[PDB]
Amino acid sequence: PSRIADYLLLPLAEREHVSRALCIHTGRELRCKVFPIKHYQDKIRPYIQLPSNITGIVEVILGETKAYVFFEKDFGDMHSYVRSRKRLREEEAARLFKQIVSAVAHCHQSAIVLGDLKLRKFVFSTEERTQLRLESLEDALSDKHGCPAYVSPEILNTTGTYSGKAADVWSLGVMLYTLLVGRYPFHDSDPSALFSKIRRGQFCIPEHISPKARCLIRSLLRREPSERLTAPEILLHPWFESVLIVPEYQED
């Protein structure tokens, strides 16, 4: 039977590298995912050590070779939320998107490129579903299934080399559009058409989206990466106003 510090580890219905972590003293229920420590240090730890909790990590237990990351259960992701709401009203979209952007700005200011930004990368911290956190543990909205909706112009043009931070901002643009409209801005099921529209920056913002929201979307989905807002700059965009330590313990 699997016991680590004062937690009992139990298999989860899925069981990727994730388990149930029950506190032996109280029955408090967390989640645990195990990683090689090298991988934890390189890919997970940076997120924990930002100044400000954008993750829901409670603590990390560092064994011999492996890191046991204990985190809070979440209350669903933003992909499922948009799907169930169809699309968000501007006031909610702005509240939630500001939390998303604040997370990314923090990351970028410590030289952390995410590279995998999507609505499913953000999850609710409570049952209220008013506060999002970054899914940092590597753990419907198009014409058909499997739209590569986060493909940027850089990744189609250039030669593979481009700005990580500016590519994340493109992803913030796709996310913002999708929050407000309920479909991705580039959503063709035919990849020829999709890639053509992405390279040429061709998408349509419905008329009823406010002027401040429309120019913010446009300011993120600029074809030229150098022309996009930085994540810090997004936080000061007039749209928002218009509508509005993790401990590490060693073990044997």
Q: Which of 6, 116, 143, 190 is catalytic?
A: 116
Tokens 């579903």, residue?
Answer: 129
How far is residue 133's CA from residue 75's CA, in Å, rounded to a whole number?
A: 10
Q: Specify whether domain 1-73 bears CATH 2.30.42.10.
A: no
Query: Three-state DSSP class for 8?
Result: strand
Distances from the Cα of 71 to the Cα of 43, 45, 47, 190, 208, angstroms: 16, 13, 13, 40, 40
Instruction: Tell me the two tokens of residue 131.
Output: 């506060």
Instruction: Convert 98-163 into a string of H (helix), E (strand) and C (coil).
Output: HHHHHHHHHHHHCCCCCCCCCHHHEEECCCCCCCEEECCCCCCCCCCCCCCCCCCHHHHCCCCCCC
116 is catalytic: yes
Using alpha carbons, select from 226, 206, 218 the residue that is nearest to residue 172: 218
Using alpha carbons, select from 178, 158, 180, 174 the residue that is nearest to residue 226: 158
How many CB atoms are located within 10 Å of the residue 38 CB?
10
End-to-end CA distance of the chain: 17
CB 78 within 8 A of CB 122: yes
Using alpha carbons, select from 113, 88, 99 the residue that is nearest to residue 235: 99
Residue type at position 36: P
CB proximity list for 235: less than 8 A, separation 6 or greater: 98, 101, 102, 105
How far is residue 195's CA from residue 188's CA, in Å, rounded to a whole number?
A: 9
How far is residue 139's CA from residue 143's CA, in Å, rounded to a whole number?
A: 26
CB 78 within 8 A of CB 120: yes
Q: Enter the resolution in angstroms.
A: 2.1
Q: Give CATH for domain 74-252.
A: 1.10.510.10
Which residues in the chain are classed under CATH 3.30.200.20? 1-73
Number of alpha carbons in the 13 Å side-chain half-sphere of residue 188: 13
Which residues in the chain are classed under CATH 1.10.510.10? 74-252
